[PDB]
Amino acid sequence: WDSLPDELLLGIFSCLCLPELLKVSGVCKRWYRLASDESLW
Amino acid sequence: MAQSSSKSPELLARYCDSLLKKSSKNPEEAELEDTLNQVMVVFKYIEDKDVFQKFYAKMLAKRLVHQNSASDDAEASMISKLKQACGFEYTSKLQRMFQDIGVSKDLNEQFKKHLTNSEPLDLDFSIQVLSSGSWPFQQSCTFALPSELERSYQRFTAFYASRHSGRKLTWLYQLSKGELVTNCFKNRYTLQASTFQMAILLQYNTEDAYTVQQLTDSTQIKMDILAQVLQILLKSKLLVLEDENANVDEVELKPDTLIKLYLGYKNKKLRVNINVPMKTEQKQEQETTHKNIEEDRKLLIQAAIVRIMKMRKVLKHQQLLGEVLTQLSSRFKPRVPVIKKCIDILIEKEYLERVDGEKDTYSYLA
Amino acid sequence: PSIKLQSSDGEIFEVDVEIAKQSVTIKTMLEDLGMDPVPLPNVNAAILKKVIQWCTHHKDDDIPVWDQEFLKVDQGTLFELILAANYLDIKGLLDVTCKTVANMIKGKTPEEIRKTFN
Amino acid sequence: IGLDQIWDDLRAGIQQVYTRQSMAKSRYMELYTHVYNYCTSQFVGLELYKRLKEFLKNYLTNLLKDGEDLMDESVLKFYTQQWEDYRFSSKVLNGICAYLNRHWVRRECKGIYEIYSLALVTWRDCLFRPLNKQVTNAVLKLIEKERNGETINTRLISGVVQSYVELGLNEDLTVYKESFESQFLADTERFYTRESTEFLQQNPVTEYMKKAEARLLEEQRRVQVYLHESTQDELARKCEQVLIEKHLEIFHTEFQNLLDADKNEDLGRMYNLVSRIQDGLGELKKLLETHIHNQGLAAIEKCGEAALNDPKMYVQTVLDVHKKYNALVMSAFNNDAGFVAALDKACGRFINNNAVTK
Amino acid sequence: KKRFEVKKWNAVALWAWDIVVDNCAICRNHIMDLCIECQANQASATSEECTVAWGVCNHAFHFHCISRWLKTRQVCPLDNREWEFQKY
Ligand SMILES: [Zn+2]
Ligand SMILES: [Zn+2]
């Protein structure tokens, strides 16, 4: 969260199988856009 | 001088004769050997490697007969070099004359060890049966040799009958030698000479001096060529003419002039050799085997037109002009005029013909 | 080799060369562009502790099982470990660890995530 | 954060660092951090990057003035010097800024991209038009004291080459080659044309070649000592043409002289100097061949009229000549097939048509 | 009186097979220019070249008794095995 940046946090979301990103997709506002391609897909 | 543009290979030839022939003393082994290689570096450049070919044998054919080529092992080598890369013709002939001259050396032992058997004979005989189909030595008139030969001649002839039920023989007379003795002159001499010389030099045991013919029929060799030998003996001072003044060299010679014995005959030193040709055959030697060269330029190529024609039977005359050289003339450089001449020859021998297809065609018969 | 590491808080760790070389942030400033007391105002010892040693272990270099043991501390302690490897920029540790920050999502739901991430 | 309290804090360090007042490691991190802290709050990189860029732009653009109009000795000191001093702080700027390189830039899939690269890239607002020509002529002058010259500008020249290369471009061995090797080579091509010929006017061919053979090695050496290596083959190509073939005619001529004398040593470095030029031997080969053909010639004549009447002397006369020249083929012409050939041809062009025969 | 005796003599002799040298073993009549073909039809440009020539397998014959008498398939009859030209 707060402390954790985008570039980093966006690294975690990189070891998740695409379909999984649908779960994270709704955790919280921020997490949503992040799920949208920035490096993923 | 004379019109020779190929006299060179004759030199490269005359050279080797000098190098091996029995030297005044002997060669240093390596010297000779190392030296022979040189002649070869030279030879593999010779344009018409076909002339060095023949004379080279006429040199050896003689060096062997007489055995005047010391260090035989050496020459046994100058073979090896000639073998490599200039045809293989030299490998056939040459050495034979050098190995044939060997069996004969064993033949001698055929006469000696056996001789002891029960074989009387007062002589130091020792003949060298040559390979007729090799040693270019020609035979012409028949010479018959008296005193102390007809004791061996038939002895052998007879002996040889022993080993070849249909064998024939022919003794070389233009070429064997023998030493003599002078129990009659102011001193003792070992007159070494030729058969033809031994002859007239022996006609002084019977009635003192005779004349050409009276001295010619005696041996019945051959009159013209006779005076050749005679004149030599004359220059030796054994047989002098009737008149002191005379240029025995040049004089010519007639059937009505006397040739006797020089009762006495001083001399520098004993065992006098005398076997240096009259002078003429020193010339004849060349021409006989010189123009002889032509006998192969052409002869060879009447069979050497097919050798390439193996893969040819329908060609145009525009092509062949030179298609007998690239893969053949690796023996001589046929001049421009001497190429169109022997071609006229094979038509009459059942060979090529002007194919009736084009004005420029050859028709091979084989 | 023997380099220092006066962590943000105060402690120091007589560390070996290649031990720091894994931390690209430092591997630069030490070799050709060396340093001497290597400060780290962002990563305290309490943190560097696990670090330097984590680093200690890794020098001999599918979710690893080994690190599962070392990387098995409360969240906070971990969500600090992201931030100190990113800092000294040590890919490795960041990578693994990071993955763990994912294994808390492997098999959960939205309100379920939040139930551990708040 | 606070940039109006944060950036300046860093502009100072980026400044300090570009002056090497030698800052204590108490700062590297302090600085690095600032960055790290900035790019952590997925952009957070741009501004900082936009800002740094200017910092370099200005500093160079306002230090060109210290360089422009500079001499060709004085200028090199200036560029070379400012270069080292730069690529250095340039690099150390990287780490203090490294954090920015690896993420923030990573997202570019335009202009904005890396940093150390930038520094270089930006310096290219201090080369293309500024000192460039200027700096290279400087180098050219020096290298021209290819005459009795002085020794250390090496640093002055190699120093340029350095930046001309790594300036190599980068954007998105050319510069150094466009900007430098082009002219350098050019100028070099003239230097030896003025020298070669003028020389061949008041000196021996075979005194020239020693001067020829000398400079080729010489310029070979300079490429190694301080110019970039890529610039070797060619320079060899150029200087070769110039010092051995263009003169390939005096050589062709002189050659026949040596052959007449027996100046092997000379004759030899010719077969070595020519050899360096495309099929430029053709003549020596045909030339030589004519020689020993005439040699074995006069040779055998000097003996036969009534001397062919000597079997050995003849075959001897021949072989001797053969030896001398085979001797010279290996030694002088390195047993090059081309000459052995000339040797053979010519021998087979005399052994058979002479005064012993005709 | 006078006298010279053959202290020592030497000799040599080219060989051959019995006696056949007088003919090509084909043209038996004499040793002139016959060779059959050149004696059956006079007036030509080949009667100028019909001297004497030898071989290697010992048979004895003329000079023209080589081309108009031989060619077939392999080596000399009776004495095959191998053959050599030489003897010019
Ligand atoms: Zn017949
Ligand atoms: Zn006939």
UniProtKB/Swiss-Prot annotation, chain A:
Intracellular or extracellular location(s): Cytoplasm; Nucleus
Post-translational modification: Phosphorylated on serine and threonine resudues in response to DNA damage, promoting 'Lys-63'-linked ubiquitination of NBN. Ubiquitinated by the APC/C complex, leading to its degradation by the proteasome. Deubiquitinated by USP13.
Function description: Substrate recognition component of a SCF (SKP1-CUL1-F-box protein) E3 ubiquitin-protein ligase complex which mediates the ubiquitination and subsequent proteasomal degradation of target proteins involved in cell cycle progression, signal transduction and transcription. Specifically recognizes phosphorylated CDKN1B/p27kip and is involved in regulation of G1/S transition. Degradation of CDKN1B/p27kip also requires CKS1. Recognizes target proteins ORC1, CDT1, RBL2, KMT2A/MLL1, CDK9, RAG2, NBN, FOXO1, UBP43, YTHDF2, and probably MYC, TOB1 and TAL1. Degradation of TAL1 also requires STUB1.
Domain F-box: from-to ranges: 1-41
Name of the protein this chain belongs to: S-phase kinase-associated protein 2
Residue numbers of the full-length protein present here: 97 to 137 of 424
UniProtKB/Swiss-Prot annotation, chain C:
Gene: SKP1
Region (Interaction with the F-box domain of F-box proteins): 82-118
InterPro entries for the chain: SKP1, SKP1-like, SKP1-like_dim_sf, SKP1/BTB/POZ_sf, Skp1_comp_dimer, Skp1_comp_POZ
CDD domains, sorted: BTB_POZ_SKP1
Pathway(s) served: Protein modification; protein ubiquitination
Protein name: S-phase kinase-associated protein 1
Role according to the record: Essential component of the SCF (SKP1-CUL1-F-box protein) ubiquitin ligase complex, which mediates the ubiquitination of proteins involved in cell cycle progression, signal transduction and transcription. In the SCF complex, serves as an adapter that links the F-box protein to CUL1. The functional specificity of the SCF complex depends on the F-box protein as substrate recognition component. SCF(BTRC) and SCF(FBXW11) direct ubiquitination of CTNNB1 and participate in Wnt signaling. SCF(FBXW11) directs ubiquitination of phosphorylated NFKBIA.
Similarity annotation: Belongs to the SKP1 family.
Organism: Homo sapiens
Ubl conjugation found in the keyword field: yes
GO cellular component terms listed in the entry, alphabetical order: centrosome; Cul7-RING ubiquitin ligase complex; cytoplasm; cytosol; nucleoplasm; nucleus; PcG protein complex; SCF ubiquitin ligase complex
Post-translational modification: Undergoes autophagy-mediated degradation in the liver in a time-dependent manner.
Any one GO biological process: maintenance of protein location in nucleus
Residues recorded as bearing Phosphothreonine in the entry: 109
Example GO molecular function: ubiquitin-like ligase-substrate adaptor activity
Pfam families: Skp1, Skp1_POZ
Record's keyword terms, sorted: Host-virus interaction, Isopeptide bond, Phosphoprotein, Ubl conjugation, Ubl conjugation pathway
From Swiss-Prot, chain D:
Tissue: Expressed in lung fibroblasts.
Record's comment on post-translational modification: Neddylated; which enhances the ubiquitination activity of SCF. Neddylation prevents binding of the inhibitor CAND1. Neddylation leads to structural rearrangment in the complex that allows interaction between the E2 ubiquitin-conjugating enzyme and the acceptor ubiquitin. Deneddylated via its interaction with the COP9 signalosome (CSN) complex.
Annotated function: Core component of multiple cullin-RING-based SCF (SKP1-CUL1-F-box protein) E3 ubiquitin-protein ligase complexes, which mediate the ubiquitination of proteins involved in cell cycle progression, signal transduction and transcription. SCF complexes and ARIH1 collaborate in tandem to mediate ubiquitination of target proteins. In the SCF complex, serves as a rigid scaffold that organizes the SKP1-F-box protein and RBX1 subunits. May contribute to catalysis through positioning of the substrate and the ubiquitin-conjugating enzyme.
Similarity comment: Belongs to the cullin family.
Entry note about domains: The Cullin neddylation domain restrains the RING domain of RBX1 in the E3 ubiquitin-protein ligase complex; this restraint is removed upon neddylation of the cullin.
Protein name listed in UniProt: Cullin-1
Organism (species): Homo sapiens
Full-sequence portion shown in this chain: 15 to 410 of 776
Swiss-Prot record, chain E:
The protein's assembly and partners: Component of multiple Cul1-RING E3 ubiquitin-protein ligase complexes commonly known as SCF (SKP1-CUL1-F-box) complexes, consisting of CUL1, SKP1, RBX1 and a variable F-box domain-containing protein. Part of a SCF(SKP2) complex consisting of CUL1, RBX1, SKP1 and SKP2. Part of a SCF(FBXO3) complex consisting of CUL1, FBXO3, RBX1 and SKP1; this complex interacts with PML via FBXO3. Component of the SCF(Cyclin F) complex consisting of CUL1, RBX1, SKP1 and CCNF. Identified in a SCF E3 ubiquitin ligase complex together with HINT1 and CDC34.
EC identifiers of the protein: 2.3.2.27, 2.3.2.32
One BP annotation, GO: positive regulation of proteasomal ubiquitin-dependent protein catabolic process
Subcellular location field: Cytoplasm; Nucleus
Lineage of the species this protein comes from: Eukaryota, Metazoa, Chordata, Craniata, Vertebrata
Gene Ontology CC terms, in alphabetical order: Cul2-RING ubiquitin ligase complex; Cul3-RING ubiquitin ligase complex; Cul4-RING E3 ubiquitin ligase complex; Cul4A-RING E3 ubiquitin ligase complex; Cul4B-RING E3 ubiquitin ligase complex; Cul5-RING ubiquitin ligase complex; Cul7-RING ubiquitin ligase complex; cullin-RING ubiquitin ligase complex
Domain of life: Eukaryota
Chain residues that bind Zn(2+) 3: 57, 59, 76, 79
Protein known as: E3 ubiquitin-protein ligase RBX1
Keyword set, alphabetical order: Acetylation, Cytoplasm, DNA damage, DNA repair, Host-virus interaction, Metal-binding, Nucleus, Phosphoprotein, Transferase, Ubl conjugation pathway, Zinc, Zinc-finger
Encoding gene, per UniProt annotation: RBX1
Keyword 4Fe-4S appears in the UniProt entry: no
